[PDB]
Structure 1
Amino acid sequence: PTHLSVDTKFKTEGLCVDIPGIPKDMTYRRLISMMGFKMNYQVNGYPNMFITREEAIRHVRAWIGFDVEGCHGTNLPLQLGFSTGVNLVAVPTPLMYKGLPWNVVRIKIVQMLSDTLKNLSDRVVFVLWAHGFELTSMKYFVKIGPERTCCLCDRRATCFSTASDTYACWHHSIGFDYVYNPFMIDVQQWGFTGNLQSNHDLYCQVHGNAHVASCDAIMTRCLAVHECFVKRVDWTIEYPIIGDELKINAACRKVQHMVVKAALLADKFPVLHDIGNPKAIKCVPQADVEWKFYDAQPCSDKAYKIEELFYSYHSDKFTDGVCLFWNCNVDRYPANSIVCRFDTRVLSNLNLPGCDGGSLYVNKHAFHTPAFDKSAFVNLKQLPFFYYSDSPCESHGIDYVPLKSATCITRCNLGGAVCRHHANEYRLYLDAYNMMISAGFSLWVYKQFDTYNLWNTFT
């Protein structure tokens, strides 16, 4: 019990309007066969085209919604919709494309999945609300066989060329014409009542339905993400490194020690209220303050209501000292807050589109994050960039151009000439900070926060 058995049952009711007469008793084995594929009793690391929920969840970065609509079945033109927003029209002979045969349409499919997936995943998982035309259309652009490696690298193959009779991964697939060894999962096998739109719209206002293929494909992946990452949350599942995950996580630790350390030095709060992750530690262990912790798991669905977090009767006085919300998403921060809030709208490889304007940020773990709302920060201001150190000016061990910055808050710069050590640290910390910002995290602070207050911490 790791892979989906081909002898598992498949509920065919969803199928029976595109495919009138379909047996009620049906396995994956008979379905895969019906879709026109011979598995060839093969023990070569691809037991089933179809996969478990848990396998799909481990492979979320691979998810592409797929939907087909009878545009007028061998007879008639098909509309191919993907959760990239692409619509291709195949003939037998937002983006909407004109009617073209399978031999060109399949080239476009490889180009499309390869660009989308090459920096996310080693595979594709077509996410379905299966009614029949999507399953029967796959023979026109899919080939299955034993697991293979790229003809130019050691990445597993995801594409095949009939021109060259060779195999490529997503990176090396240019001019390839077939999707090789795809995975797929039918959402309609998870026990839903009524149609897609009805269930999607229970959870999501952001994706409308223009009655076109791409719209259903997006709605399908949305509902899938809702079920697997919003309503259900599995924080145990790890995920491969595919980008700057380790630099971003480190940057985030540095910035947090910096900002909170300086917040305490500037306004000398007697108590810090640390609201969020129950695993969180004192980011400034040295600081004078009463450090009080308050457990709140990352809300995946709707942002926490400050009313429900604080009131219902703690120092209880959360208006005493400062409230630290480090990736704790609430509706409206109090004015005495330091806030780190992930911006769901950022374009990166770590950040997958989500449900109801939210986003799925995958970095070691998967965290569905509520839609960024600018109105949450009305009592606060954007935190300005700055570097602060009280460490001795002293090189040790980093080639130089004399550092001039107003935002380098150090004994040296007060004395008008930044020492080389604090100039190395400064340009390191600025890089970290830039990393974190571009990665999508935003920083906000109580309005009275003024970096001018930090200079007098040397005298």
Structure 2
Amino acid sequence: PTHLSVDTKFKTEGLCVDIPGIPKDMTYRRLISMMGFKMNYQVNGYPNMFITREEAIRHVRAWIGFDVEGCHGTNLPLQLGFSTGVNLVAVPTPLMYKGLPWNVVRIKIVQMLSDTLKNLSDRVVFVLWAHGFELTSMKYFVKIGPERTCCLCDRRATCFSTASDTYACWHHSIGFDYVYNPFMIDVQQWGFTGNLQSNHDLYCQVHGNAHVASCDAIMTRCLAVHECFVKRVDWTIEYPIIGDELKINAACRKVQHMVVKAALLADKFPVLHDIGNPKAIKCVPQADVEWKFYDAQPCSDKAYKIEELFYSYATHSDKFTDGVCLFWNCNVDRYPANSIVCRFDTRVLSNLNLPGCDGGSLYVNKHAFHTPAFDKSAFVNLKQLPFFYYSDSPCESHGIDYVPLKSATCITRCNLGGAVCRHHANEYRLYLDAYNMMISAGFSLWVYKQFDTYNLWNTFT
């Protein structure tokens, strides 16, 4: 039960307007045959062009929505739209390109997928709401065969060139003309009522429907992300390393210990309310405070209402007003004034952050986390946390060449005393680097307005 049997049934109702007379009884095997591909009973890593929901979900980084509209069937021109916002017109003879033959259109398809996917995935998954023309158009830009490797590296082959008769991955495909061994999934097999627009629009107000093909392609991927990562969530599925995942996760642990340690030293809160991941550990384990945990899973859909987190049914809610609240990636509509907050900025551009549903983003770093749209109004009671480095650690080298550090934000005994020691300068530069890493990954840090780093200097006396 790993791969999708070619002898599985494919519901054909969706296809019968572009393909009138299509049999109600249809297998992937006969559909793939109809699309013009020969699978020559082959056991070489590519048993099916089509894949399971489960397989699509392991490969969410490879998803490209794809839609074709009959512009006025070998007879007529076709509008090719992709979730990248690109529209190509192919003649048989927002970005919108004039009519060209398949032999140039196919080169543009390879360039576009390569530049989109080379830092994301080892493959492409075309996400369809299939009506027929997208499926019969694939023969014009796709070739299949046994799994292969790039002619320049060890990565699996995703492209093919007729000019050179060679195979490339997404990194090495410049001037290649065919997509090689693509995958695909028809969202219309998932058992929806009514059309794409009506299903999409239930969940998402951000993607309009200008009635161009890219609009449908974007909506199709959006609906699919909603179904696989918002309504349903599976946090067991791991995802490969493709960038700075480890450095970023380490940075977030370092910034969290630093900021909460400094807050406790500066304002000496008697109680900390730690709201969010039910597996969360004390980020400052030596600190004096009453540490009280509150369980909330990552909200995939809408930010939590603070009122709902405090709603206690027939018992009294704990008083939040006492001490400080820590929301470390726990996304609520409006934070209380006495909060420390880490909140992921869905708008950030990175290889980890994929476009999501209704203005949210799918952040994929070991696990996949759909995050509700970033909203500045959530922080009305807070201010941005300023950068600072704090250490009570002794001034002591042990065992990196030097320019001496001067900074107002290096809060150590040595800087109090007039000259930063080498140990604290090394630690300061490492911590500035981790902080910059975390910010540029898309985390934003907010704090109660009374927070003042001036209060930290008298913890050395």
TM-score normalised according to structure 1 size:
1.00
Indicate if the aligned counterparts of 2:385 and 2:446 stay in contact, CA closer than 8 A. Answer: yes
C-alpha distance in 1, partners of 2:402/2:392? 21
Determine the structure 2 residue equivalent to 1:328.
330
Cα distance in structure 1, aligned partners of 2:400 and 2:177? 50
Alignment of 1:32-111 (within 5 A): 32-111=32-111
How far apart in 2 are the matches of 1:402 and 1:359? 42
User: In structure 1, the residue corresponding to 2:348 is in which secondary structure?
Assistant: coil
Secondary structure of the corresponding residue to residue 275 of structure 2:
strand
For the residues of structure 2 that align with 1:44 and 1:447, how far apart are their CA atoms?
62
Partner secondary structure for residue 160 of structure 1: strand
Instruction: State the distance in 2 between where 1:329 and 1:59 align.
Output: 26
> Which deviations, in whole Å up to 9, do the C-alpha atoms of 1:370-401 show, x marking residues without a partner?
00000000000000000000000000011110
Shift of residue 311 of structure 1?
A: 3.2
Q: Which runs of 4+ in 1 moved over 4 A?
A: none
CA deviation string 1:106-127 (max 9, x = no partner): 0000000000000000000000
Helix, strand or coil at the partner of 1:203: coil
Which secondary structure state, in structure 2, belongs to the residue aligned with residue 299 of structure 1? Answer: coil
Quote the Cα distance in structure 2 between the aligned partners of 1:390 and 1:315: 36
Query: Are 2:70 and 2:77, in contact at CA under 8 Å, matched by a contact in 1?
Result: yes
CA drift at 1:444: 0.1
Question: What CA distance in whole angstroms lies between the structure 1 residues aligned with 2:311 and 2:138?
Answer: 55
What SS class does the counterpart of residue 199 from structure 2 fall into? helix
Larger mean Cα displacement after TM superposition, 362-371 or 314-323: 314-323
| CA deviation map 1:41-96 (0-9, x unaligned) | 00000000000000000000000000000001111100000000000000000100
Aligned partners of 1:402, 1:283: CA distance in 2, in Å? Answer: 31
Match of 1:424 among 423, 426, 432: 426
Give me the whole-angstrom Cα distance separating, in 2, the residues matched to 1:33 and 1:311. 57
Mapped to 2, the partners of 1:189 and 1:158 lie a distance apart of 25
C-alpha displacement of 1:298: 0.3
Conserved in 1, the CA contact under 8 Å of 2:18 and 2:132?
yes
Distance 1:269 1:97 in 2: 61
Q: Distance in 2 between matches of 1:231 and 1:40?
A: 39
TM-score, normalisation: structure 2:
0.99
Partner Cα distance (2:358, 2:312) in 1 = 29
Structure 2 residue matching 1:452: 3-state secondary structure? helix
> What is aligned with 2:369?
367
Unaligned runs of 5+ in 2: none
Deviations 1:151-178 (A, max 9, x none): 0000000000000000000000000000
Give 1:196 deviation, angstroms: 0.1
1:338 Cα deviation from its structure 2 partner: 0.1
Deviation at 1:312, TM superposition (A): 3.4
Equivalent residue, structure 1, for 2:346: 344
Looking at structure 1, the residues matched to 86 and 264 of structure 2 have their Cα atoms a distance apart, in angstroms, of: 51
Question: 1: CA distance between counterparts of 2:281 and 2:153?
Answer: 42
d(CA) in 1 for partners of 2:19, 2:311:
57
Do the aligned partners of 2:310 and 2:317 also contact (CA within 8 Å) in 1? no
Rounded Cα–Cα distance in structure 2 between residues aligned with 1:134 and 1:262: 57
Looking at structure 1, the residues matched to 345 and 327 of structure 2 have their Cα atoms a distance apart, in angstroms, of 15
Deviation per residue, 1:177-210 (Å, 9 max, x gap): 0000000000000000000000000000000000
Matched, 1:173 2:148: no
Q: Secondary structure at the match of 1:217?
A: helix
- Cα distance in 2 for residues equivalent to 1:253 and 1:383: 16
Q: Deviations over 1:252-295 (max 9, x none)?
A: 00000000000000000000000000000000000000000000
Looking at structure 1, the residues matched to 214 and 311 of structure 2 have their Cα atoms a distance apart, in angstroms, of 44
Contact 2:157-2:167 at 8 Å conserved across structures:
yes
* Cα distance in 2, alignment partners of residues 211 and 236 from structure 1: 38
Q: What CA distance in whole angstroms lies between the structure 1 residues aligned with 2:312 and 2:388?
A: 38
Question: For residues 11-41 of structure 1, what are the alpha-carbon distances to aligned partners after superposition, in whole Å with 9 as ceiling and x for unaligned?
Answer: 0000000000000000000000000000000
The CA distance in 1 between the partners of 2:229 and 2:75, in whole Å, is: 40
Find the aligned partners of 2:404 and 2:366 in 1 and give their Cα distance. 39
Shift of 1:439: 0.2
Give 1:298's aligned residue.
298
- Please give the secondary structure, in 2, of the residue aligned with 1:414: helix
SS in structure 2 at match of 1:110: helix
Kindly indicate whether the alpha-carbon contact (under 8 Å) linking 2:311 and 2:317 is maintained by their aligned counterparts in 1.
Answer: no
1:332 partner SS: coil
CA contact (8 A) 2:229 2:369 kept: yes
What is the CA–CA distance in structure 2 between the aligned matches of 1:311 and 1:175, rounded to whole Å? 60
**How far does the alpha carbon of each residue in 1:338-363 deviate from its partner, in whole angstroms, 9 at most, with x for none?**
00000000000000000000000000
Offset of residue 333 of structure 1: 0.1
What's the CA shift for 1:310? 1.2
Specify whether residues 261 and 315 from structure 1 end up closer, same or farther in structure 2 by C-alpha distance, changes over 3 A only: farther
> The residue matched to 2:149 in structure 1 has which SS?
coil
* Unaligned ranges ≥5, structure 1: none
Determine the C-alpha separation between the residues in 1 that align with 2:31 and 2:75.
22
Retained in 1: the 8 A contact 2:150–2:169?
yes
Q: Which residue of 2 aligns with 1:247?
A: 247
**SS of residue in 2 equivalent to 1:307:** helix
Distance 1:431 1:370 in 2: 28
Q: Spell out, residue by residue over 1:387-423, the C-alpha distance to the aligned partner (whole angstroms, 9 max, x if none).
A: 0000000000111101000000000000010000000
Residue in 2 aligned with 1:236? 236
**Distance (whole Å) between structure 1 residues aligned to residue 419 and residue 199 of structure 2:** 64
Q: Deviations over 1:226-262 (max 9, x none)?
A: 0000000000000000000000000000000000000
User: 1:406 and 1:24 mapped to 2: Cα distance?
Assistant: 73
Q: Distance in 1 between matches of 2:317 and 2:371?
A: 28
Q: Calculate percent identity across the aligned residue pairs.
A: 100
Alpha-carbon distance between aligned partners in 2 of 1:353 and 1:312, rounded to the nearest angstrom: 35
> For the residues of structure 1 that align with 2:422 and 2:239, how far apart are their CA atoms?
39
Distance in 2 (CA, whole Å) between partners of 1:411 and 1:40 is 74
CA distance in 1 between partners of 2:287 and 2:75 (Å) = 74
Q: What is the Cα deviation at residue 315 of structure 1? A: 7.3
* SS of residue in 1 equivalent to 2:172: coil
